[PDB]
Amino acid sequence: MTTFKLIINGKTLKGEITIEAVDAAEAEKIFKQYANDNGIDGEWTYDDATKTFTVTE
Predict the structure, then answer these.
(1) Phi first, then psi: what are they for 36, rounded to 5°?
(2) Domain range annotation of the chain
């Protein structure tokens, strides 16, 4: 069960949409694409302690 999350730290989007992926690396890609489709572009940080990223805008 590899469900990675993503906290959005910016005016665009705001939550932790959980998604499954081969590893956190792919999750960051799925998260880094899901953000563009909405307009989320800023910073990015992965949390290996909570399996959650952090996309700022």
Answers:
(1) -60, -45
(2) 1-57
Beta bridge partners of 54: 7
Class level of CATH domain 1-57: alpha beta
Method used to solve the structure: NMR
Contact at 8 Å (CB) between 27 and 4?
yes
Q: Taking a C-beta distance cutoff of 8 angstroms, is the pair 15, 5 a contact?
A: no
Cβ contact 11:57 at 8 Å? yes
Torsion of CA 14, 20, 24, 28, to 10 degrees: -40
For 15-57, the DSSP string reads: SB--EE-SSHHHHHHHHHHHHHHHT--S----BTTTTEEEEE-
